[PDB]
Every structure is written in structure tokens, then in C-alpha cells.
Write a protein that binds this ligand. Structure first.
Ligand SMILES: CCCCCCCCCCCCCCCCCC(=O)OC[C@H](COP(=O)(O)OC[C@H](O)CO)OC(=O)CCCCCCCCCCCCCCC
Ligand SMILES: CCCCCCCCCCCCCCCCCC(=O)OC[C@H](COP(=O)(O)OC[C@H](O)CO)OC(=O)CCCCCCCCCCCCCCC
Ligand SMILES: CCCCCCCCCCCCCCCCCC(=O)OC[C@H](COP(=O)(O)OC[C@H](O)CO)OC(=O)CCCCCCCCCCCCCCC
Ligand SMILES: CCCCCCCCCCCCCCCCCC(=O)OC[C@H](COP(=O)(O)OC[C@H](O)CO)OC(=O)CCCCCCCCCCCCCCC
Ligand SMILES: CCCCCCCCCCCCCCCCCC(=O)OC[C@H](COP(=O)(O)OC[C@H](O)CO)OC(=O)CCCCCCCCCCCCCCC
Ligand SMILES: CCCCCCCCCCCCCCCCCC(=O)OC[C@H](COP(=O)(O)OC[C@H](O)CO)OC(=O)CCCCCCCCCCCCCCC
Ligand SMILES: CC(C)CCC[C@@H](C)[C@H]1CC[C@H]2[C@@H]3CC=C4C[C@@H](OC(=O)CCC(=O)O)CC[C@]4(C)[C@H]3CC[C@]12C
Ligand SMILES: CC(C)CCC[C@@H](C)[C@H]1CC[C@H]2[C@@H]3CC=C4C[C@@H](OC(=O)CCC(=O)O)CC[C@]4(C)[C@H]3CC[C@]12C
Lengths: 470, 470
């Protein structure tokens, strides 16, 4: 009961953060009809959460060293929970944007602390391997459950969708309070100048990329804000040389296999993210499943995901992370090839759509556990904070970049086969077929990106003694 | 009875040529101890067969049009059978070289004609699908049976190994005489200037490539002969513009998928050849099975490959050659990866060495049949000759090129890990472990080359209606 309560509590913010984003996307069309925030306001509710979430993420890495990881985890979750109630009673667009900003601040604090608590709470060995599986397990549970909740009670009101976080957030605070322990160690003074410039450098960049498409890539505020991001980054690196308790220990990233590992998670996160966004759109638009049915149809992915995670936790103590990552992805690679050839519109569910999802889930489950363990290997307690924060930022940063490339490819080929850009409800059924074939073509591009992750994963070179088996 | 006799006869030259090369390699050390031909003559017996086999191969493609494909097939096999007898009674090195030169001429005349007999003898449909499987099936039978025969009857005398072809060559000539019919079509005038220049260019290129390492890549005769190869190649292309019944119809290779299909077989042949050469050396050297035991241990490969060929012949009428080539090699890609991680010295036979061979054999069998049917698709009867000759030449040319790259990578990592260049019998057992891991490393490079074949195979685009299903 004690070990079970601890692993569930540590992975709580992965459940909440992934579930909230999926619900917010689902309920966007109605928030127009009620608030009338217009097409401009459509993207501010999304970008507001991402503006502070990425900006303050590297500040939240070092906030557990100077104050405490258990306190930091609880405070971040509590602020996230409170902000969800305020977002559910937003009067107009203005109230909603402040609400989404505060959720990003709370998530920026608790997300890095959750992955740091995995390394510092469970000693290397079977304990850390079981905890790693649960931490990655609940990220998929929240994603699928966000569809089901986002598709089930959407029909009544979008305000009840943001209140579902409140019961869940309260349970994670209670579990973390009575299951986690405060470490009795002296605090480290926070790096003021290093922490400030990192927030300014990151926040300005996120703002510039988000507003760029709205005003154009050469509007003047797009590259004008990029100038501030560049100037802040240059000043951050210079002061970082003579920094005490540094925010980003550049020296810890050398020519060894830490860069290879951290290069994989950035590009792997892009493949995982773009595969999730494209598949959801295809099932909703082409196959006409709807939000509720799509969420219930992805339940087998979670069960398949769990089987891969559970098997990998046992095998990680006998096989190096190199073979397990390759072995798991080989199953995933076959699943995407099958879908790229035999996934037209109107196919049945059980034979065609279930098996590739089940096979792909086991492959992903096998590869995530070795990669997470090697990302937190050979670090310690005085540098686990920033290293865990860097891991989550690269995973999230690689999402939008790879997906941006993929979506451009899908759009281009839809016009090539003969099609239109715009809402799917006004297509001629000859223009809908072109969109279908475009999505499967873009799945080959995702396969090419996955292959590059594999060759870069051949250079890891960690033994099962270092990542696990201690 | 008439059908089985016809398919066996057409593939007879594939069994003989593949069997002869394997037997010739096995018996080279003993030919040294008897004839005392020195190391220089050791390689001349091999190059003599290839010098005329590759030099005259393109000539034989158009020889069946002006003489007849049945008469051309009997003449080539007959000359091959006679020369094997002359090779078995060679008293000095001169007699052996002229004997090996004659065998290449016989193989050059019959090898292109055998593949052209597949397209002309059997109508497009299930009959041609079954004939193609048998044609590919007994190319593999000769290789494994060459090990068994060469490794068995070479503790008595190496001369007897060359007489084993005589019974087989006689049987194929009888079957071809009583099972094939001579087409009644008017003969075509041979392209005199085009044929002589094509022969001179191909022989000179082989000569310079073979003699280069002996005399050095800049000896004076190496690049001296390469000068003649370039001059003959240029003149061949110019005169082919105004050539009637061209030896190489360049216009038949446009931007369509004929180039993609013919580029796949070039590099696919290289992957197959280097995979066969390296696996044989590893089994004999690292594992120490010997030639006889190695041949008996590769019997499951032929059985496994027969299943792949038999299954693929049925499926080729419903699925395009694109998916079958990708589907078959996906099994082969996994087999190479498993052998690249769990294949050290001292492992048993049935658990570790049998299964990857069986899985790889089925994958190879699945992809061979679709590639062969698309290489002889949509040509006719007045150009099937030269097109079949080009298909075999690219397959044979790709072997040495890819294997040269692989063997260079093997040698470099042997020295890097700590190793010695020389015979394997003078090794320290610490120098022998380095050679073990060099071979396992090179298997990753063969898998990387296979991936390139796959992406290049995604551009084929043939439908099952064209290659088969008639
Ligand atoms: C090289 C420099 C590159 C820096 C660029 C950063 C741009 C931020 C991402 C783009 C903003 C808008 C889109 C978006 O982000 O959305 C995805 C997700 C929310 O999920 P969604 O709501 O989309 O739901 C899913 C739906 O189903 C599908 O539509 O947010 C994220 O995690 C984004 C990662 C950003 C956080 C970490 C890094 C930020 C700081 C940059 C450091 C370098 C600058 C330093 C100088
Ligand atoms: C990385 C290491 C970490 C180290 C660094 C430390 C970080 C630790 C974190 C670990 C957690 C990672 C994995 C978590 C998984 C999350 C994804 C998820 O659980 O979500 C499921 C998704 C639903 O997405 P949603 O719909 O909710 O959101 C989209 C909106 O709807 C649209 O805006 O779908 C799926 O089940 C994906 C199935 C993939 C299987 C293989 C593909 C087979 C091909 C079939 C043909 C398809 C047609 C072609 C189409 C092209
Ligand atoms: C000294 C000390 C080292 C010094 C530092 C080196 C750092 C690395 C740089 C090179 C990394 C690039 C890798 C190569 C690449 O860029 O290319 C991919 C590779 C090459 O071969 P290709 O076939 O691509 O060759 C065609 C050419 O690319 C065209 O020129 O591919 C492979 O062989 C990999 C086999 C495994 C793939 C199958 C399994 C999937 C992988 C797992 C995914 C898990 C997902 C995670 C789930 C979250
Ligand atoms: C410019 C250069 C021209 C092209 C080079 C061709 C390679 C020659 C063979 C080199 C000798 C060793 C390798 C070898 O020969 O092995 C393959 C096979 C017999 O196997 P082996 O009996 O050697 O045993 C195997 C051992 O285990 C491994 O060494 O021979 C062949 O088919 C080789 C190609 C000849 C057929 C057609 C292409 C030649 C004409 C080129 C035309 C373009 C020029 C234009 C101007
Ligand atoms: C292409 C389309 C055509 C269109 C154009 C028209 C042309 C039509 C032709 C069709 C015929 C093609 C295929 C025929 C197959 C021939 C090969 C064969 O039948 O021969 C078997 C070979 C024995 O070779 P030999 O010994 O005789 O000769 C070597 C000397 O001994 C050395 O000098 O072995 C094998 O069974 C290969 C097994 C591969 C399985 C996959 C790999 C698994 C990895 C396991 C770990 C291994 C250790 C690592 C090691 C690195
Ligand atoms: C108008 C006319 C049309 C235009 C003409 C185009 C011609 C072809 C050129 C491109 C072909 C090269 C392919 C690209 C490549 O080289 O790349 C492989 C590709 C991409 O991924 P990469 O990551 O490598 O891309 C590189 C990175 O960009 C480096 O930076 O991979 C795939 O998706 C392929 C999946 C299939 C492989 C698995 C199955 C095995 C294949 C069968 C072999 C059977 C053997 C036969 C036995 C006989
Ligand atoms: C459907 C028919 C016409 C088959 C033709 C397929 C080609 C049009 C596609 C198939 C796979 C594609 C490749 C798949 C993956 C990549 C990886 C891609 O690399 C990245 O994904 C980097 C993106 C990033 O890192 O941000 C560059 C293009 C390339 C080679 C693509 C080039 C074009 C290819 C060969
Ligand atoms: C202990 C460390 C050094 C091992 C890490 C593995 C890498 C050193 C190897 C693994 C496979 C290799 C790749 C395997 C295959 C190829 C194909 C090769 O493509 C070919 O053109 C070869 C075949 C041909 O010549 O036709 C180019 C290099 C590359 C990408 C190799 C580059 C180096 C890689 C990634």
C-alpha cells in the first residue's frame, strides 16, 4: 500500500497535465459560441497555457533544491487545481486567459519535480524500474481519458469539463502528503540572474513563434520579439559560466552518451506527439468516430501500453537499453507500415484498426522505460533537478516542431491529389478521399523520423548495470 | 509431368552456375598444394570465369533473337558441361585458365536466355508466377548443395568435385530437349558494331577492376585498361542511337518505374551477395563447423526459402509488388538485427543459429518473386532478350560493389578493437574475439543498406494487373 501510494502520487501531474490539454482542445468550438471570443481568441486560450508552461519550466527545476521537492510538488499541484476552478467560471475572454496562465505556472513547477522525485525517492534497482513504468503509464491513461471525458459530458456544458480535475487533483495532494517524505538536507541559494534570464529568454521565444503566424513571420513583432529572445539567451549563457548552483549545467553535457540520449528524447517526443495528433484527427474526420467513441476505441492502446511497460521493467536488468529501444520500436515500425497500406475509409474496427494499435502500443511501451532510466542515470542529488527539467523541455519542444513539418506535408499532398483547405464538413466526397490518402502518406514520413531515432539510439552504449540493476 | 519438366529445365543454368562457383571456392586451397600455382594464380582461376561471364553476358541477350532461345539454351549448357570435364583433367595452370574461360562463355550464353525463357514460354498469369518461384528456388539449392558436395568430396581429390556437374548438365539438356518448343519467328539481324563495343567495354572494366589490387590502383595497366573501358563505353552509346535491333535499348528506360525497379535489383543483389559471403566466413572461421557441416546446417534455409517463394506466388495476384517486397524484407530486417546482438562465439545451433536463418529465408523468398515479375513486365518479345540480360548483369554487378564496402568496414573495426590481419589459424583467442565482434558490427551496415532498398522500392507503383494476373 505504501509503495503503491507513492508511485501513483509521483506520477499525478503527468495524468493531470495530459488530460487537461486534451479536454481543452475538445471544448474549443463551444467556447466560441458562448464567450464569442472570435477566431483571434481561439488560439489565445491554448497558447496562454503553453506560454508560461515552457517559460517557467527551467525555473521549476531548481526550486526543489532551495525550498524542497515534496513542498514544490504539492504547491504546484494545488495552484493547478485552484486555477482549474477559476477557469470553469471565467466570465469573459479576459478572465479565461488569466486562468490559463495560472495553470501553466503551476504545471511548470510540478512537472519537473515529478520526474526528479522518481530518481530521488526510489533507489536504483527493481524499485526505480517499477516506478518508471507507472510514471510513463499514467501519461497515456490521462490522454485517452481526456477524450472520453471530453467526449462524454461535452454535450451538456464545457464548464463541467474543467471541474473534473478538482476531484483528481485533491486525491493526488492527499496521497503525496501521507506517502512522500521530506528530505532533511540544507537548502541551496537560488541563482537569481540565471533564473531570471532563462525565463525571459524562453518566454519571449514561445511568444514569437506563437504570434508569428497571426501577424506573419516578418511582421516586425515576430522577429522583433525574436531579437529579445536571442539577446536574453546570449546573456544567459555568459553569466552561466561563473554561476553557483547553475540553472543549466552545460559542463554536464559533453561528448559522452548523455547528448545521444537527450537527442533521442527530443526527436522521439516529436514522433510520439505527431503520431497522436494525426491519428486523432484521422479517426474523427475520415472515419467519423466522434470524440466519445474515439476515446473508448483507444482503450486497447492503454492495455497494450501497460503490457509493454510491465515486460520492459523486468527485462531492463538483463538487457541493455540499446536493444530494448530497438526491439520495441521494431514492433512499432511494422504497425505504422501496415496502417500506411491498409487503412482506407470504411474499413471495420476489430480486425483493421485494433491490431496495429495494440502492436504499436507494446512497441512504444518497451522503448520508453529504458530511455527514461538512461536519462536520469549517473547524476546524483545536487544536479537531478535541472537534468530532469531539461528532459521534459526537450520532450515537449520536439512535439510542435516535428508535427509542423508533418502537417505541411499532409496539406501539400491533399492539394496534389485534388482537394481543398478548410473545414472537412464542406467536402465533396471526392475531395474527402484525397484527404484520406494524404494522411496515410504522412504516416510514411513519421516512419522515416522514427528510423532516424533508431540509428541515433545505436550510440547510447549504457550497460544494464548503470541505468538499472543496482 | 510436362509442366514440371519445363520449369526445371529453364532453371538448370541457375543451379549449375551457382553450384560451380561455390565448389570452385571450396577447392582453391587444395588446387594450390597440387598444381603449385602460387598466390597470383590462386585468384586467376576465379577471375577467369568472371572475365568472360561478365564480358559476354550482354552479347548473349540478343543472341537468342537471331539464333533461337531453345538452341541458344542448349548450346550454352552443353559448352558449360564439356568445359567442366576439361577443368577436371587440367595438368598445369594454363589448362585450368582456358578451362575456366570456356565455362564463363557457356554461362554467359545460357544465363540470360534462361530468364528470357520464363517470360516467353509461360503466359502471364499463375503459370508465370509458379515458374518464377522455381527459377529462384534452385538458385539457392545450388549454393547450399555446392557446400555439401564441395565439402564432402574434397577429402579424396578436388578433381572429382568438377565432375559432379556432368550428370546434372546432361539431365538438363535432355529435359530441355523434350519439354521446350522452338518458336517459329523470323530471325533478327544482329547488331555487329554495337555488340563488339559492348563486349570490349565490359571485359576491359572487369579486367581493370580485378587486376587493380594486384598491381595497384595507379599501376599504369589498371587505369590504362580503364581508359579503354571508357573509350569503348562512349563509342557504344553513340553508335546505339542509329542501331537497328539495339543491344541496349536506352529509350526503354525513361523516368517511369523501370529505373526504380532496375535500381532496386542492383542494390538488392549487393545485399544478398554480401550477406551470403559474410555469413559463410563467420560460420567456418568463428564457429568452426567446416564445409560439410556448414552445408548441412543451411538446409533449413532452402526449406524456409521454398515456403516464402511458394506463398508469394499465390499472393502476387492480389497484392502489388510494392507491399510484398516491403513485407518480406521487414522479416529479413528483424533477422539481421537479432543476429547482430545475440550471435557471439560458442552459442548452440538450434536455439540461436537456426531460427534467424529460417526467418530471413522466408523474408527473402517473399520479396524475390514480386521483384522478378516486375523486371520482365510490359516488354514484349522483340526486347525481352536485352532487358533480361540487363536484369541479371545489375544483380551480379551489385554483389562485389556492396561486399567491397562491407569488407572494408570489417577490417577497420578488427584493428580498432585490437586485431591482426592474416590467416585466422594464427590468432591469440583475444585477437579472435575482436574478429567476432567485427563481423557482428558489419551486419548493421548490411541492414542499413537494406533500408535504402526499401525506400527506393516505395516508388515502384506497379499494379498486380500488370506484373501478374493475366
Ligand atoms: C530552436 C528554438 C525553438 C523554440 C520554440 C518554442 C515554441 C513553443 C511551442 C509552440 C507553441 C504552440 C503549440 C503548442 O505548444 O502546443 C503543443 C503543446 C500543448 O498541447 P495542445 O494544447 O496543442 O494539445 C494537443 C492537441 O491535441 C493538438 O492540437 O505544448 C507544448 O508542450 C509545447 C512545447 C513548448 C514548451 C517547452 C519549450 C518552450 C521554450 C523554448 C526554449 C527555447 C527558447 C530559448 C531562447
Ligand atoms: C520518450 C521517452 C521519455 C523520456 C523523457 C521523460 C518523459 C516521460 C514521459 C513518458 C510518456 C510517453 C508516452 C505517453 C503516450 C501519450 C499518447 C496517448 O496516450 O494518446 C493516445 C492517442 C490519442 O490522441 P488524442 O486523440 O487524445 O489527441 C489528439 C487530438 O484528438 C487531435 O487534435 O492515440 C493513440 O492511441 C496512438 C496510437 C499509436 C500506435 C501506432 C500507430 C499505428 C497506425 C494505425 C493507422 C492510423 C491512421 C493513419 C493516420 C495518419
Ligand atoms: C564513437 C562515439 C559516438 C559519437 C557521437 C555520435 C552521435 C550520433 C550521430 C549519428 C546518428 C545518426 C543515425 C543514423 C541515421 O540518421 O539514420 C538512421 C539509421 C541509419 O540507417 P538508415 O537505414 O537510416 O540508412 C539510410 C541513410 O539514413 C540515408 O543516408 O537507421 C538504422 O539503421 C537504425 C535501425 C533501427 C531502426 C528500427 C527500430 C526503430 C528505432 C526505435 C524507435 C523508438 C521510438 C521511441 C518511442 C518513444
Ligand atoms: C569499372 C569496373 C567494372 C565492374 C566490376 C565488376 C566486378 C568484377 C568481379 C570482381 C572479382 C571478385 C568478385 C566476384 O567476381 O564475385 C561476384 C561474381 C562471382 O563470384 P566469385 O566466383 O568471385 O565468388 C565470390 C567470392 O566469394 C567473393 O569474392 O562475379 C560477378 O558476376 C561479378 C560481375 C561480373 C558480371 C557483370 C558485370 C561486369 C561488367 C561491367 C560492365 C560495365 C563497364 C562499362 C565500361
Ligand atoms: C533480387 C531480385 C532478382 C531480380 C533479377 C533476376 C535474378 C533472379 C535470381 C534469384 C535468386 C536470388 C536469391 C538466391 C539465394 C542464394 C544464396 C544462397 O543460397 O546461399 C546461402 C548462404 C550460403 O553461402 P555459401 O557458404 O555457399 O558461400 C559463402 C562462402 O562460403 C564464403 O566465401 O547462406 C545463407 O543461408 C544466408 C542466410 C541469410 C539469412 C538472414 C541473416 C540472419 C543473421 C544471422 C547471423 C549470422 C552471423 C553474422 C555474420 C556477419
Ligand atoms: C517522378 C519519378 C519519381 C522519383 C524517383 C525516385 C527514386 C528513388 C529515390 C529515393 C529512394 C531512397 C529512399 C530513402 C532512403 O534512403 O531512406 C530510406 C527510407 C527513409 O528513411 P531514412 O531515415 O533512411 O531517410 C534518410 C534520412 O533522411 C538521413 O538523414 O526508409 C523507409 O521509410 C523505407 C521503409 C522500408 C524498409 C524496411 C523493409 C526492408 C526493405 C526491403 C528489402 C528487401 C531485400 C530484397 C532481397 C532480394
Ligand atoms: C506514396 C508514394 C508516392 C511513395 C513515395 C514516398 C516518398 C514520397 C517519401 C516516402 C518516405 C519519405 C521520406 C520519409 C522521411 C524523411 C525524413 C525527413 O526527415 C525528417 O523527418 C526531419 C524533420 C525534423 O527533424 O524536423 C526528410 C524527408 C524524408 C527523407 C522523406 C522523403 C520522401 C519519402 C522517401
Ligand atoms: C559502438 C558504436 C561506434 C556503434 C554505433 C553504431 C554506428 C557506428 C553504425 C551502426 C550502423 C551504421 C550505419 C549503417 C549503415 C549505413 C549505410 C551506409 O550506406 C551504404 O551506402 C552502405 C551500402 C552501399 O555501399 O551500398 C552509410 C553509413 C550507414 C548509415 C552507417 C553509419 C554508422 C552506423 C549508424
Amino acid at each position: 500500500r505504501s509503495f503503491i501510494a507513492a508511485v501513483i502520487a509521483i506520477g499525478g501531474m503527468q495524468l493531470l497535465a495530459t488530460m487537461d490539454s486534451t479536454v481543452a482542445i475538445v471544448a474549443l468550438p463551444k467556447i466560441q459560441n458562448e464567450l464569442s471570443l472570435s477566431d483571434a481568441g481561439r488560439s489565445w486560450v491554448i497558447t496562454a497555457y503553453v506560454l508560461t508552461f515552457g517559460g517557467l519550466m527551467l525555473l521549476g527545476g531548481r526550486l526543489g533544491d532551495t525550498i524542497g521537492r515534496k513542498r514544490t510538488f504539492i504547491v504546484g499541484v494545488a495552484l493547478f487545481t485552484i486555477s482549474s476552478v477559476l477557469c470553469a467560471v471565467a466570465w469573459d475572454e479576459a478572465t479565461l486567459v488569466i486562468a490559463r496562465l495560472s495553470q501553466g505556472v503551476g504545471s511548470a513547477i510540478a512537472s519537473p519535480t515529478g520526474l526528479a522525485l522518481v530518481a530521488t525517492t526510489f533507489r536504483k534497482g527493481p524499485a526505480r524500474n517499477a516506478a518508471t513504468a507507472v510514471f510513463a503509464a499514467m501519461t497515456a491513461i490521462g490522454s485517452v481519458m481526456g477524450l472520453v471525458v471530453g467526449g462524454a459530458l461535452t454535450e451538456v456544458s464545457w464548464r463541467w469539463a474543467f471541474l473534473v480535475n478538482v476531484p483528481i487533483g485533491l486525491v493526488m495532494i492527499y496521497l503525496a502528503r501521507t506517502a512522500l517524505r521530506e528530505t532533511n538536507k540544507e537548502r541551496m541559494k537560488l541563482d537569481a540572474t540565471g533564473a531570471i534570464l532563462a525565463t525571459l529568454a524562453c518566454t519571449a521565444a514561445v511568444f514569437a513563434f506563437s504570434i508569428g503566424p497571426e501577424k506573419g513571420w516578418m511582421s516586425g513583432i515576430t522577429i522583433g520579439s525574436g531579437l529579445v529572445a536571442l539577446a536574453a539567451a546570449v546573456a544567459f549563457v555568459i553569466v552561466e559560466r561563473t554561476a553557483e548552483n547553475p540553472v543549466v549545467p552545460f559542463h554536464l553535457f559533453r561528448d559522452r552518451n548523455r547528448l545521444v540520449t537527450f537527442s533521442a528524447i527530443l526527436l522521439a517526443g516529436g514522433v510520439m506527439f505527431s503520431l497522436t495528433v494525426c491519428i486523432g484527427l484521422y479517426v474523427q474526420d475520415i472515419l467519423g468516430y466522434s470524440a466519445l467513441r474515439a476515446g473508448v476505441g483507444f482503450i486497447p492502446f492503454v492495455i497494450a501500453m501497460g503490457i509493454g511497460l510491465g515486460v520492459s521493467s523486468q527485462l531492463v536488468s538483463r538487457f541493455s537499453p540499446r536493444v530494448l529501444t530497438i526491439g520495441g520500436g521494431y514492433l512499432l515500425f511494422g504497425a505504422m507500415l501496415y496502417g500506411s497500406f491498409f487503412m482506407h475509409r470504411g474499413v471495420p474496427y476489430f480486425p483493421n484498426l485494433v491490431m496495429p494499435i495494440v502492436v504499436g502500443g507494446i512497441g512504444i511501451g518497451m522503448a520508453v522505460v529504458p530511455l527514461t532510466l538512461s536519462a536520469i542515470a549517473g547524476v546524483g542529488f545536487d544536479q537531478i533537478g535541472p537534468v530532469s527539467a531539461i528532459a521534459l523541455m526537450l520532450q515537449s519542444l520536439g512535439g510542435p516542431l516535428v508535427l509542423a513539418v508533418i502537417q505541411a506535408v499532409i496539406t501539400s499532398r491533399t492539394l496534389y491529389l485534388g482537394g481543398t483547405t478548410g473545414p472537412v464538413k464542406f467536402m465533396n466526397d471526392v475531395q474527402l478521399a484525397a484527404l484520406d490518402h494524404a494522411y496515410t502518406y504522412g504516416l510514411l514520413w513519421v516512419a522515416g523520423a522514427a528510423i532516424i531515432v533508431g540509428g541515433m539510439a545505436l550510440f547510447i552504449g549504457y550497460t544494464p548495470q548503470q541505468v538499472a540493476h543496482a
